[PDB]
């Protein structure tokens, strides 16, 4: 519970699922992003109840929640500030002319954060390059982890919705609503593909529907040119048709370390 007096609003960063997000200073010194929650976009009381849990989630590679402001409307969510913004856009900028090592570097960051959530048995539910951020050092961090539970948009929270993360979702999710640490693993594999394909949309030639048939038939995403055999094998391991046969984030992290050492 941060006092709003300790906040100054400086510039606009954009708009997300809960509305406008601003850059500004906390306590006149610390860079912050401040979500201004559009009224009616969130289960606000539930989020407030469960926000205490999300504040204990502290990791070098998770976008840190600093505090909330809930004695006013709209409510605020104060978070760590990421200077280079959204990973997806960052990947799509060709001037960066990334080396494959820098790409694997970005995978190791996300995996490190997910490893920690997995230990805390805390599901993201929407892991994708659009939901990851890049700070002034090129470090990638996982953002908005766990906030899917409080969305009040039926285009997002329904399987048939226009905003549902279909292309990041394993078959068991899409057909049965079977959510587990394994559906975060699946999404993580898709995110590794994103990174090595340099921001291409997964199944770029298919609709969401064609994508769901495709993966129910045991068919998967092709190797991005910039992925070696070893890197491709890692993401594909995330996509086993049996959920319980997919690796942990612990195993994936050690997998990534190996290629780093090898290639
Ligand atoms: C010209 N300018 C130059 C500068 N550019 C720039 C530079 C820096 C930044 N830095 C930052 C941008 C954002 C930011 C801004 C707008 C929207 C969102 N999103 C996207 C993901 C998301 C998912 C979900 C769900 C629920 C879907 C999940 N999971 C719910 C949500 F609320 C949101 C959300 O709010 C974010 C990220 O939270 C947050 N933080 C902390 C930054 O540091 N952003 C932009 C912008 C363009």
UniProtKB/Swiss-Prot annotation:
Extract the signal peptide range: none
Annotated effect of mutating residue 126 to N: In XLA; severe
Q: Where is the active site?
A: 126 (proton acceptor)
Tell me the outcome of changing residue 35 to E: In XLA; loss of phosphorylation of GTF2I
Q: Mutating residue 172 to K has which effect?
A: In XLA; severe
Phosphotyrosine PTM positions read 156, 222
What is known to happen upon mutating residue 147 to P?
In XLA; growth hormone deficiency
Listed result of changing residue 126 to H: In XLA; severe
Annotated residues that bind ATP are located at 13-21, 35
Q: Where, by tissue, is this protein expressed?
A: Predominantly expressed in B-lymphocytes.
Q: What does the UniProt entry list as the effect of changing residue 13 to P?
A: In XLA; moderate
Residues recorded as binding clofedanol, renumbered to this chain, are 79-82, 147
Where is the PTM Phosphoserine found along the chain? Answer: 209, 228
Residues that, per the record, bind dasatinib:
79-82
Q: Where is this motif: CAV1-binding?
A: 186-193
Report the family membership.
Belongs to the protein kinase superfamily. Tyr protein kinase family. TEC subfamily.
Described purpose of this protein according to its UniProt entry: Non-receptor tyrosine kinase indispensable for B lymphocyte development, differentiation and signaling. Binding of antigen to the B-cell antigen receptor (BCR) triggers signaling that ultimately leads to B-cell activation. After BCR engagement and activation at the plasma membrane, phosphorylates PLCG2 at several sites, igniting the downstream signaling pathway through calcium mobilization, followed by activation of the protein kinase C (PKC) family members. PLCG2 phosphorylation is performed in close cooperation with the adapter protein B-cell linker protein BLNK.
| UniProt disease link | X-linked agammaglobulinemia: Humoral immunodeficiency disease which results in developmental defects in the maturation pathway of B-cells. Affected boys have normal levels of pre-B-cells in their bone marrow but virtually no circulating mature B-lymphocytes. This results in a lack of immunoglobulins of all classes and leads to recurrent bacterial infections like otitis, conjunctivitis, dermatitis, sinusitis in the first few years of life, or even some patients present overwhelming sepsis or meningitis, resulting in death in a few hours. Growth hormone deficiency, isolated, 3, with agammaglobulinemia: An X-linked recessive disorder characterized by growth hormone deficiency, short stature, delayed bone age, agammaglobulinemia with markedly reduced numbers of B cells, and good response to treatment with growth hormone.
What's written under domain? Answer: The PH domain mediates the binding to inositol polyphosphate and phosphoinositides, leading to its targeting to the plasma membrane. It is extended in the BTK kinase family by a region designated the TH (Tec homology) domain, which consists of about 80 residues preceding the SH3 domain.
User: Quaternary state and partners of this protein?
Assistant: Part of a complex composed of EEIG1, TNFRSF11A/RANK, PLCG2, GAB2, TEC and BTK; complex formation increases in the presence of TNFSF11/RANKL. Binds GTF2I through the PH domain. Interacts with SH3BP5 via the SH3 domain. Interacts with IBTK via its PH domain. Interacts with ARID3A, CAV1, FASLG, PIN1, TLR8 and TLR9. Interacts with MPL/TPOR.
| Record protein name field | Tyrosine-protein kinase BTK
| Source organism | Homo sapiens
């Amino acid at each position: 519970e941060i006092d709003p007096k300790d906040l100054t609003f400086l510039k606009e960063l954009g708009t997300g699922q809960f509305g406008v997000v601003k850059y500004g200073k906390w306590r006149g010194q610390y860079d912050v992003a401040i979500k201004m929650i559009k009224e009616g976009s969130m289960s606000e009381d539930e989020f407030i109840e469960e926000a205490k849990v999300m504040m204990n989630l502290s990791h070098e590679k998770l976008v840190q929640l600093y505090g909330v402001c809930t004695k006013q409307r709209p409510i605020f969510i104060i978070t760590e500030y990421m200077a280079n913004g959204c990973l997806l856009n960052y990947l799509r900028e060709a001037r960066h002319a990334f080396q494959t090592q820098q790409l694997l570097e970005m995978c190791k960051d996300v995996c490190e954060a997910m490893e920690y959530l997995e230990s805390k048995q805390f599901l993201h539910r929407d892991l994708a390059a659009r939901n990851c951020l890049v700070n002034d050092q090129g470090v990638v961090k996982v953002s908005d982890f766990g906030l899917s539970r409080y969305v009040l948009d039926d285009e997002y929270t329904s399987s048939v919705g226009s905003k549902f993360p279909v292309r990041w979702s394993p078959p068991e999710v899409l057909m049965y609503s079977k959510f587990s640490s394994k559906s975060d693993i699946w999404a993580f594999g898709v995110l590794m593909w994103e990174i090595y394909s340099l921001g291409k949309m997964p199944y770029e030639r298919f609709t969401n529907s064609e994508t769901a048939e495709h993966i129910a038939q045991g068919l998967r995403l092709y190797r991005p040119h910039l992925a070696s055999a070893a890197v491709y094998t890692i993401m594909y391991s995330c996509w086993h048709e049996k959920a319980d046969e997919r690796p942990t984030f612990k195993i994936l992290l050690s997998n990534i370390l190996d290629v780093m050492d090898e290639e």
